[PDB]
Enzyme design. Sequence first.
Site, PDB file in Angstrom:
ATOM      1  N   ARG A  24       9.762  -6.484  14.458  1.00 20.40           N
ATOM      2  CA  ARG A  24       9.984  -5.424  15.649  1.00 20.40           C
ATOM      3  C   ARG A  24       9.611  -6.366  16.954  1.00 20.40           C
ATOM      4  NH1 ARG A  24       5.184  -5.072  17.910  1.00 20.40           N
ATOM      5  NH2 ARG A  24       3.536  -4.668  16.578  1.00 20.40           N
ATOM      6  N   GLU A  61     -16.524  -5.858  16.022  1.00 18.61           N
ATOM      7  CA  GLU A  61     -15.740  -4.744  16.087  1.00 18.61           C
ATOM      8  C   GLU A  61     -15.935  -3.749  14.896  1.00 18.61           C
ATOM      9  OE1 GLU A  61     -11.855  -5.440  14.062  1.00 18.61           O
ATOM     10  OE2 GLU A  61     -10.874  -4.957  16.103  1.00 18.61           O
ATOM     11  N   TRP A  83      -9.608  -6.276  22.432  1.00 18.25           N
ATOM     12  CA  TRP A  83      -9.017  -4.751  22.600  1.00 18.25           C
ATOM     13  C   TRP A  83      -8.879  -4.541  24.320  1.00 18.25           C
ATOM     14  CZ3 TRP A  83      -7.586  -1.268  18.745  1.00 18.25           C
ATOM     15  CH2 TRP A  83      -8.034  -1.594  17.473  1.00 18.25           C
ATOM     16  N   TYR A 135      -9.172   3.013  14.862  1.00 15.02           N
ATOM     17  CA  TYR A 135      -9.769   3.142  13.557  1.00 15.02           C
ATOM     18  C   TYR A 135     -11.189   3.906  13.454  1.00 15.02           C
ATOM     19  CZ  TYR A 135      -6.634  -0.297  11.682  1.00 15.02           C
ATOM     20  OH  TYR A 135      -5.548  -0.894  11.372  1.00 15.02           O
ATOM     21  N   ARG A 167     -13.148   8.793  -8.773  1.00 13.65           N
ATOM     22  CA  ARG A 167     -12.179   8.036  -8.430  1.00 13.65           C
ATOM     23  C   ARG A 167     -11.651   8.835  -7.050  1.00 13.65           C
ATOM     24  NH1 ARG A 167     -10.809  11.172 -13.534  1.00 13.65           N
ATOM     25  NH2 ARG A 167     -10.897   9.724 -15.121  1.00 13.65           N
ATOM     26  N   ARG A 168     -12.367   9.433  -6.293  1.00 18.27           N
ATOM     27  CA  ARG A 168     -11.811   9.783  -4.931  1.00 18.27           C
ATOM     28  C   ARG A 168     -12.578   9.430  -3.747  1.00 18.27           C
ATOM     29  NH1 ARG A 168     -11.882  15.991  -7.507  1.00 18.27           N
ATOM     30  NH2 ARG A 168     -10.197  15.712  -8.964  1.00 18.27           N
ATOM     31  N   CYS A 187      -2.629  -0.837  10.842  1.00 18.73           N
ATOM     32  CA  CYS A 187      -2.138  -1.762   9.346  1.00 18.73           C
ATOM     33  C   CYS A 187      -3.067  -1.613   8.406  1.00 18.73           C
ATOM     34  CB  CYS A 187      -2.454  -3.047  10.064  1.00 18.73           C
ATOM     35  SG  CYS A 187      -1.092  -3.732  11.289  1.00 18.73           S
ATOM     36  N   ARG A 207      -0.829  -2.141   5.267  1.00 21.74           N
ATOM     37  CA  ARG A 207       0.974  -1.886   5.102  1.00 21.74           C
ATOM     38  C   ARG A 207       1.630  -3.242   5.840  1.00 21.74           C
ATOM     39  NH1 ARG A 207       2.948  -1.695   9.980  1.00 21.74           N
ATOM     40  NH2 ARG A 207       1.587  -1.220  11.871  1.00 21.74           N
ATOM     41  N   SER A 208       0.804  -4.119   6.487  1.00 22.19           N
ATOM     42  CA  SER A 208       1.501  -4.843   7.356  1.00 22.19           C
ATOM     43  C   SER A 208       0.419  -6.038   7.795  1.00 22.19           C
ATOM     44  CB  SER A 208       1.910  -4.215   8.730  1.00 22.19           C
ATOM     45  OG  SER A 208       2.330  -4.996   9.599  1.00 22.19           O
ATOM     46  N   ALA A 209       0.737  -7.309   7.352  1.00 18.48           N
ATOM     47  CA  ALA A 209      -0.466  -8.195   7.506  1.00 18.48           C
ATOM     48  C   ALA A 209       0.114  -9.378   7.921  1.00 18.48           C
ATOM     49  CB  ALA A 209      -1.042  -8.803   6.096  1.00 18.48           C
ATOM     50  N   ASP A 210      -0.147 -10.106   9.226  1.00 21.03           N
ATOM     51  CA  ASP A 210      -0.058 -11.106   9.908  1.00 21.03           C
ATOM     52  C   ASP A 210      -1.037 -12.260   9.352  1.00 21.03           C
ATOM     53  OD1 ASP A 210      -0.057 -13.748  11.499  1.00 21.03           O
ATOM     54  OD2 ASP A 210      -0.325 -12.598  13.361  1.00 21.03           O
ATOM     55  N   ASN A 218      -9.328  -9.742   8.725  1.00 23.75           N
ATOM     56  CA  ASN A 218      -9.363  -8.619   8.089  1.00 23.75           C
ATOM     57  C   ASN A 218     -10.335  -8.840   6.853  1.00 23.75           C
ATOM     58  OD1 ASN A 218      -6.089  -7.824   8.993  1.00 23.75           O
ATOM     59  ND2 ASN A 218      -7.847  -7.344  10.043  1.00 23.75           N
ATOM     60  N   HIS A 248       3.331 -11.226   5.819  1.00 23.16           N
ATOM     61  CA  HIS A 248       4.116 -12.201   6.660  1.00 23.16           C
ATOM     62  C   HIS A 248       3.579 -13.198   7.290  1.00 23.16           C
ATOM     63  CE1 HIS A 248       3.151  -8.622   8.881  1.00 23.16           C
ATOM     64  NE2 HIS A 248       3.051  -9.674  10.048  1.00 23.16           N
ATOM     65  N   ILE A 249       4.338 -14.293   7.374  1.00 19.36           N
ATOM     66  CA  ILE A 249       3.928 -15.385   8.428  1.00 19.36           C
ATOM     67  C   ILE A 249       4.995 -15.253   9.498  1.00 19.36           C
ATOM     68  CG2 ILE A 249       3.958 -17.764   8.677  1.00 19.36           C
ATOM     69  CD1 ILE A 249       3.120 -17.990   5.512  1.00 19.36           C
TER      70      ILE A 249
HETATM   71  O1  LIG Z   1      -5.764  -6.034  11.680  1.00 18.65           O
HETATM   72  C1  LIG Z   1      -4.498  -6.340  11.718  1.00 18.65           C
HETATM   73  C2  LIG Z   1      -3.859  -5.781  12.889  1.00 18.65           C
HETATM   74  C3  LIG Z   1      -2.455  -6.103  12.932  1.00 18.65           C
HETATM   75  N1  LIG Z   1      -1.850  -7.100  12.282  1.00 18.65           N
HETATM   76  C4  LIG Z   1      -0.581  -7.487  12.158  1.00 18.65           C
HETATM   77  C5  LIG Z   1       0.499  -7.080  11.465  1.00 18.65           C
HETATM   78  C6  LIG Z   1       1.854  -7.276  12.308  1.00 18.65           C
HETATM   79  O2  LIG Z   1       2.291  -8.445  12.525  1.00 18.65           O
HETATM   80  C7  LIG Z   1       1.296  -6.688  13.428  1.00 18.65           C
HETATM   81  C8  LIG Z   1       1.545  -5.185  13.737  1.00 18.65           C
HETATM   82  O3  LIG Z   1       2.924  -4.773  13.760  1.00 18.65           O
HETATM   83  P1  LIG Z   1       3.639  -3.664  12.919  1.00 18.65           P
HETATM   84  O4  LIG Z   1       3.441  -3.776  11.442  1.00 18.65           O
HETATM   85  O5  LIG Z   1       2.993  -2.422  13.420  1.00 18.65           O
HETATM   86  O6  LIG Z   1       5.119  -3.925  13.340  1.00 18.65           O
HETATM   87  O7  LIG Z   1       0.079  -7.064  13.696  1.00 18.65           O
HETATM   88  C9  LIG Z   1      -2.767  -7.725  11.171  1.00 18.65           C
HETATM   89  O8  LIG Z   1      -2.203  -8.594  10.365  1.00 18.65           O
HETATM   90  N2  LIG Z   1      -4.230  -7.189  10.861  1.00 18.65           N
HETATM   91  O1  LIG Z   2       0.350  11.692 -11.591  1.00 19.76           O
HETATM   92  C1  LIG Z   2      -0.704  11.563 -12.120  1.00 19.76           C
HETATM   93  C2  LIG Z   2      -1.484  12.795 -11.858  1.00 19.76           C
HETATM   94  C3  LIG Z   2      -2.851  12.594 -12.664  1.00 19.76           C
HETATM   95  N1  LIG Z   2      -3.272  11.347 -13.054  1.00 19.76           N
HETATM   96  C4  LIG Z   2      -4.586  11.457 -14.093  1.00 19.76           C
HETATM   97  C5  LIG Z   2      -5.571  10.339 -13.335  1.00 19.76           C
HETATM   98  C6  LIG Z   2      -6.919  10.900 -13.783  1.00 19.76           C
HETATM   99  O2  LIG Z   2      -7.223  10.667 -15.025  1.00 19.76           O
HETATM  100  C7  LIG Z   2      -6.469  12.159 -13.364  1.00 19.76           C
HETATM  101  C8  LIG Z   2      -6.887  12.664 -11.940  1.00 19.76           C
HETATM  102  O3  LIG Z   2      -8.398  13.231 -12.043  1.00 19.76           O
HETATM  103  P1  LIG Z   2      -9.234  12.467 -10.756  1.00 19.76           P
HETATM  104  O4  LIG Z   2      -8.533  11.133 -10.783  1.00 19.76           O
HETATM  105  O5  LIG Z   2      -8.815  13.339  -9.499  1.00 19.76           O
HETATM  106  O6  LIG Z   2     -10.518  12.430 -11.212  1.00 19.76           O
HETATM  107  O7  LIG Z   2      -5.304  12.663 -13.667  1.00 19.76           O
HETATM  108  C9  LIG Z   2      -2.300  10.451 -13.248  1.00 19.76           C
HETATM  109  O8  LIG Z   2      -2.750   9.202 -13.928  1.00 19.76           O
HETATM  110  N2  LIG Z   2      -1.243  10.546 -12.653  1.00 19.76           N
END
Ligand SMILES: O=c1ccn([C@H]2C[C@H](O)[C@@H](COP(=O)(O)O)O2)c(=O)[nH]1
Ligand SMILES: O=c1ccn([C@H]2C[C@H](O)[C@@H](COP(=O)(O)O)O2)c(=O)[nH]1
Lengths: 300, 312
Positions: A24, A61, A83, A135, A167-168, A187, A207-210, A218, A248-249
Amino acid sequence: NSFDAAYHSLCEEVLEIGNTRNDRTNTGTISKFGHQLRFDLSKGFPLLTTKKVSFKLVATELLWFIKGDTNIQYLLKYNNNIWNEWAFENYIKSDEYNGPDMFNEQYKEQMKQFKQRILEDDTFAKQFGDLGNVYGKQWRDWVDKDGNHFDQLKTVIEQIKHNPDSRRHIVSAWNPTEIDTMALPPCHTMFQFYVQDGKLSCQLYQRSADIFLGVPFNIASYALLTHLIAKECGLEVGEFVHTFGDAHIYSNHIDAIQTQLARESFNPPTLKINSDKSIFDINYEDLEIVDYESHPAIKA
Amino acid sequence: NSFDAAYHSLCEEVLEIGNTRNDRTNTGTISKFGHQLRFDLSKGFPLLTTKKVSFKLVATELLWFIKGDTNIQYLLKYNNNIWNEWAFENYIKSDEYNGPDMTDFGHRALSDPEFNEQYKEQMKQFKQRILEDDTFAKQFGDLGNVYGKQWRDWVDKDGNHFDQLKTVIEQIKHNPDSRRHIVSAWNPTEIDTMALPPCHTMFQFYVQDGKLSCQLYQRSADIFLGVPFNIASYALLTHLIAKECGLEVGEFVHTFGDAHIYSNHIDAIQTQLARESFNPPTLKINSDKSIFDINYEDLEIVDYESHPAIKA
Ligand SMILES: O=c1ccn([C@H]2C[C@H](O)[C@@H](COP(=O)(O)O)O2)c(=O)[nH]1
Ligand SMILES: O=c1ccn([C@H]2C[C@H](O)[C@@H](COP(=O)(O)O)O2)c(=O)[nH]1
């Protein structure tokens, strides 16, 4: 050292197998989708040694997010500028800003005078210094339809403390109803905590890393986070696991990375939190990076 | 084959270096935290072959989620019983249930084999009546504890609706290169009340070279019962969106928080790990409709040969 080695791998892999794509920002990237790194926090703190990474900036930060402050005065207090533009871009629109429209001479100047007033004038600070797009909000302050505030971060500290086995242990920073508006939407979409043999671990999904400019930073942020949570729940530290989407680089970074990959590591530093106050009362002065040695910094 | 290989390694790794722990269900698991698997979808479609996986169950669940149907009558037409317990429980509390008190059964069905006969007996009618009486279905077939909700219908403070699925399909069409193709199922404001907090917390799409990839973050995974199913959902989901977006498929990337084999499945896994693979199947989709208009009939799995099912 294992931390540097992990990152060197990621760099190497992207160079070798990554795909050349437009982005982008119109810079162009060489990129890989999906990738996973690990870091044993028992081996010390994963602040890269093959290029300087600033602990001050990272710790400042992160504590700024965890304090639920959305005001950039705190950041300026420590000379953390990250910032600045985001907040400047508000200043420049209003019935206050009486300088040139937003050449490199002018902006640079005008940034200074702004910074100046946010520090020295308290009430000008509250005025423009309070961006809210961060954040720090998403963690401590998430809103439902009925105007209830949820606090993901408190909740997970209480669930880690009294139901470690769960696990939550999830913290999300992705609000689907706030994306299209968002200046730069997160990101670091969400993370998860795990507990075994008294040790805490954290997996992040970015999702996205420079790789050249962002990852190193990070990695340090999320390693420090673990440590903080860990201490607050009276646990030991395990791994940080760093999951990537688009790793990405940027094309303007290939050399900068090449230079890096030709450098040998130093031993990693270690981290001390010198207090027994709640980590939401913890100040930057209470953190200590012991024997941090890095090769000097590289430039774009 | 590469798909079975991937699944095998996970088991293999967990069995070795996973850690004994207790879980929310008091069953005990051996667990690893943090893992990443890939599946190249150009090689074929990843229904496991070392153990039979029911494409029928997979695809009908998924189509049901993505279509925004809250009603299990649909599921029942395909003998998909995934969600039949929640529905029986509501019914047998209602005042127009005139069978024996089915109050907190299950523990009680295992317990008592005169009751289990009345239980199986009553479930059979509930099921039959859901299928035969649309009225009865409207009034008892209908839940709220669903992934389709969050994909398709996420509401804010003011009552604006946000449909993520449809929004990313657009964004893939118009902005393939974006690093922001995200769909989330994790609504923290609702986590504390809901029945079963989503394991598939979010996923991300990616386009390179005419090819759609998808990465799933699964915070929790029953390596044995759930993962084989889960792999095939997201693989199918990759195809469906790729087709809506006029693209081909690349990879399914699968990331895990808590990857665990439950303690009573070790036996099952061991048998599976000892088996050898067949070449994977392929997926044709035989229709030019919108994926939201596509029916199970329009899907075809070709050359699926696998070893027998296992159970626990
Ligand atoms: O903590 C951060 C924040 C941003 N970015 C980078 C990822 C992308 O290069 C850009 C954000 O752009 P989008 O993925 O939103 O396009 O900044 C990081 O690597 N780390
Ligand atoms: O699509 C699914 C749905 C459930 N579980 C399993 C993971 C856990 O063993 C349990 C969910 O319980 P918690 O992770 O919420 O404890 O069900 C999966 O592996 N895949």
